[PDB]
């Protein structure tokens, strides 16, 4: 009646000492079973023995832990033992262990500073999850390049898994970026710089801009240009530009100019809004062999003569391929039980496919050829029919290919981008399997998403039963995040494909969710594939803060309101904002954080085990071959079952048929960046009221511009919290 | 004598090579070695290539 | 599974067989040269197989 199948579904990642989820399938009931696996040692005694009471038909994961190991990683062979009272089988996998750490990171005002001052900075500590953890330290120390440590701290503790700092700072240091050091018990090290520099600011604010990526056919360069030196005062004068066609062919003995061009737009500079200037790319002839050019700015000044001239978006861009289109949602791998949605869309310079160009879609093998034509957003959206061999690649032009060069040389060259692709296919010995259209686009949290996914069953079930069951399933962090089951109705021939699902989305995912169904059969066979899918960014406990309102300068009594869960500990970094956007937050966000992660996901194979030997092989089976003639033995390169568990990231033991190629051994054979005031304004630390503090700001009048807050707030009430923007006028 | 291009080449096992039994000792290959032929409903008779 | 020349008996042996159509026996099957550096590569070491 059932003949029965079994797996242990164990993420080799092992972080120590905490909740890591593993789990089981057992079905088509049989005798007895109460598996046990045992990471045994050489001897028996490093076992990471978990027997636990199973069954059949049921979906029960137990997170359990482990104590620490002895090195911070060792390979240690795993059989887990198939504990039934008149059957056992084993299978030995090496295990990726990992003394793996908690996490932690650095904040500071900026990275460049002023000679002189005192730096102030703050250190933060998370775990696994993103929660706060109070701890130790060994040590802490900035470092200077000649290696050697500028200032120090000595093993302090967390009060609240973070601490705040300063260092003092000399006015001649060298100028050079310089760097700060922490190290953990095992050795962790995270790294976070800051330069310095009191270069000059330059006087002038000579700002010039233009076109940058140009085609064989454009008519207008409308290049605007603007220079007030105060960034309030654009001067009564004239300018002048210097634009011009360049570059020998990549030859340098020519001992003379290479300008193809030189033309000067020049214009009087108006102090109503700026100055503008619309120049033409038909005198600078656009043409193939018409070279690069480079753009340069003769900003006069009126009443002092010291005439500045720079050197800004000289560098031109040889756009040496034309029409530029790509793919958009193409499903990297598909299927054959199915014609599906592979997607395209194009881009050229300003980024406007011409609206309903019409295309040649070229998916062939199949020779489902049928033209369409763009969307509003340049997109297209088709399926392709579908009784074809493994291999299938496919292309999509509204140009047409050629291959027609006349000499080797072709110096002469163009170019027009094509999207092709190349595919390769499912397993289905199953006779049933899914495809899960990806959802890779927007994304927001603090819901569910019912997901769209279309079984088969071939030859309808050869038997079955009135009830089979499916399981869809989602890896976080080295942990299963949640247990999705269903069954269907009952049927004994068919092909049908309306499947039901959905899963919340909160937090507690790796940045993708490789989500992962499979097809349990009675006969030895489960048919699956992961499904990967974003995770957005978004936290547990959102905040928000809020000031007294942005008015004129002196009235240094002001607020800052700030409003979330009832219990935190905050930073405060009210600051000006210029100074970051002179340079952006390159590293730090929410999303960075969740970046800045270590260790999202490590498919189990890593750089320990080169790979996993198992019990058959390819020239086995020497029995009576094919009636009609004679198969030899050979393979597909499609995307693979056993590969489906590694796709999950993971790894099990299982009677359901794997085999597939293992081998035979010997079968037989035997730039720079405008500046204004560093001045930092804010800088502190509170604690929330159960209601959401308010903080009474201090201006700092006499200084205009864009202000914002770098605060940060954390606890384990609600884990960690931003409220990721909130400037200032 | 077959006069046949090719019969069912795609298929999910290998493709078969041959049209006909080719083989250094196949059935007909004995009826061949004898040198005598016959006519026959059974599987014997074959072009060479 | 080695023999050995009767005074009055040569080899009568058997092998049993279980795979496919390829294959191809040989004895004195321990190496075709005595010495593959014989010399100057002028003049080749065979002896019957
Ligand atoms: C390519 O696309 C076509 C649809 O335009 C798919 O054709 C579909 O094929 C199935 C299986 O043959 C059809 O179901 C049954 O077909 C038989 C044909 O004799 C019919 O007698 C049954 O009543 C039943 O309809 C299905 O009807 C058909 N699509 C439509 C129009 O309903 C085809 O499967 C695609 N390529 C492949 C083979 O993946
Ligand atoms: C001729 C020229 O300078 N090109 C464009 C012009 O087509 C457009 O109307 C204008 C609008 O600001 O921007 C510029
Ligand atoms: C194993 C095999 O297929 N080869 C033959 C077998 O058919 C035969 O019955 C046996 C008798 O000892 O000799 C061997
Ligand atoms: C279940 O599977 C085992 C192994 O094939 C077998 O020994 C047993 O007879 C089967 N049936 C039952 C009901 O135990
Ligand atoms: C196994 O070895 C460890 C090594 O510390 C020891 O603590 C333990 O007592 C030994 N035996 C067990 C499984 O208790
Ligand atoms: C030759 O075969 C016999 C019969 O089994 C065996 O006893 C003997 O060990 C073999 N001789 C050699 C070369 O060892």
């Not at 027997?51 to 137990?62: F, R, S, T």
């Not at 300003?350 to 020779?367: D, H, L, M, S, T």
């Not at 289905?428 to 927007?442: A, C, G, N, T």
């Not at 005031?677 to 700092?700: H, K, M, Q, R, Y």
Request: aromatic content about 10%; proline content about 5%.
């Amino acid at each position: 009646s059932g003949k029965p199948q079994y797996m242990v579904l164990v993420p080799s990642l092992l972080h120590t000492e905490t909740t890591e989820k593993g789990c089981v399938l057992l079905s088509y009931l049989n005798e007895t079973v109460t598996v046990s696996a045992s990471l045994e040692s050489v001897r028996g005694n490093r076992s990471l023995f978990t027997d636990l009471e199973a069954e059949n038909d049921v979906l029960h994961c137990v997170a359990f832990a482990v104590p620490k190991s002895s090195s911070n990683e060792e390979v240690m062979f795993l059989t887990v033992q198939v504990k039934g009272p008149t059957q056992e089988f084993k299978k030995r996998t090496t295990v990726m262990v990992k003394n793996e750490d908690s996490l932690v990171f650095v904040q500071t005002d900026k990275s460049i500073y002023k000679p002189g001052q005192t730096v102030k900075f703050r250190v933060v500590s998370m775990d696994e999850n993103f929660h706060p953890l109070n701890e130790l330290i060994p040590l802490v120390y900035i470092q200077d390049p000649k290696g050697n440590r500028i200032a120090q701290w000595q093993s302090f503790q967390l009060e609240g898994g973070l601490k705040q700092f300063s260092f003092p700072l000399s006015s001649e240091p060298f100028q050079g970026s310089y760097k700060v050091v922490v190290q953990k018990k095992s050795g962790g090290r995270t790294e976070h710089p800051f330069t310095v520099e009191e270069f000059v600011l330059p006087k002038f604010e000579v700002q010039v801009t233009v076109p940058k990526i140009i085609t064989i056919l454009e008519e207008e360069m409308n290049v605007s240009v603007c220079g007030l030196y105060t960034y309030g005062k654009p001067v009564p004068g004239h300018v002048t530009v210097s634009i011009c066609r360049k570059y020998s062919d990549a030859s340098d003995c020519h001992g003379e100019d290479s300008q193809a061009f030189c033309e000067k737009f020049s214009g009087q500079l108006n102090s109503h809004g700026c100055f503008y200037q619309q120049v033409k790319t038909k005198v600078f002839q656009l043409k193939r062999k018409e070279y690069e050019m480079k753009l340069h700015t003769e900003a006069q000044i009126q009443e002092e003569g010291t005439v500045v001239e720079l050197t800004g978006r000289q560098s031109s861009e040889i756009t040496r391929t034309i029409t530029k289109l790509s793919f958009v949602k193409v499903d990297s791998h598909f299927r054959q039980g199915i014609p599906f949605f592979g997607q395209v869309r194009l881009v050229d310079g300003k980024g406007v496919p011409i609206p309903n160009k019409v295309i040649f879609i070229r998916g062939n093998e199949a020779n489902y050829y049928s033209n369409a034509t763009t969307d509003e957003h340049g997109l297209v959206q088709f399926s392709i029919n579908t009784t074809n061999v493994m291999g299938t690649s496919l292309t999509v032009r509204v140009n047409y290919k050629d291959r027609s060069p006349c000499y080797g040389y072709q110096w002469v060259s163009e170019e027009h981008e094509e999207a092709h692709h190349t595919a390769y296919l499912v397993f289905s010995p199953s006779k049933s399997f899914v495809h899960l259209e990806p959802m890779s686009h927007e994304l927001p949290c603090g819901h569910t998403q019912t997901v769209q996914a279309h079984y088969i069953l071939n030859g309808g079930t050869l038997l079955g039963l009135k009830k089979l069951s499916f399981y869809y399933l989602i890896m976080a962090k080295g942990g299963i995040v949640r247990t999705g089951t269903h069954g269907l109705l009952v049927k004994q021939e068919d092909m049908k494909g309306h499947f039901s699902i959905s899963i919340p989305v909160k937090s507690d995912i790796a940045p993708v969710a490789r989500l992962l169904i499979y097809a349990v059969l009675p006969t030895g066979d489960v048919i699956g594939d992961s499904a990967k899918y974003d995770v957005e960014n978004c936290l547990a406990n959102k905040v928000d803060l809020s000031f007294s309102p942005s008015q004129s300068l002196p009235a240094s009594h002001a607020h800052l309101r700030v409003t979330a869960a009832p219990q935190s500990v905050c930073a405060l970094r009210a600051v000006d904002q210029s100074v970051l956007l002179m340079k952006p937050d390159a590293e730090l966000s929410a999303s960075s954080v969740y970046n800045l992660l270590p260790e999202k996901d490590l498919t189990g194979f890593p750089g320990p085990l080169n790979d996993q030997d198992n019990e058959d092989c390819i020239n086995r089976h020497n029995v009576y071959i094919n009636g009609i003639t004679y198969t030899p033995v050979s393979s597909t390169n499609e995307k693979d079952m056993y590969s489906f568990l590694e796709d999950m990231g993971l790894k099990a033991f299982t009677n359901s048929k794997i085999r597939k190629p293992k081998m035979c051994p010997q079968l037989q054979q035997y730039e720079t960046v405008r500046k204004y005031f560093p001045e930092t304004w804010i800088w502190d630390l509170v604690v929330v009221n159960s209601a959401g503090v308010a903080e009474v700001g201090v201006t700092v009048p006499d200084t205009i511009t864009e202000w914002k807050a770098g605060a940060f707030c954390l606890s384990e009430d609600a884990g960690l919290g931003i409220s990721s923007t909130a400037s200032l006028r």
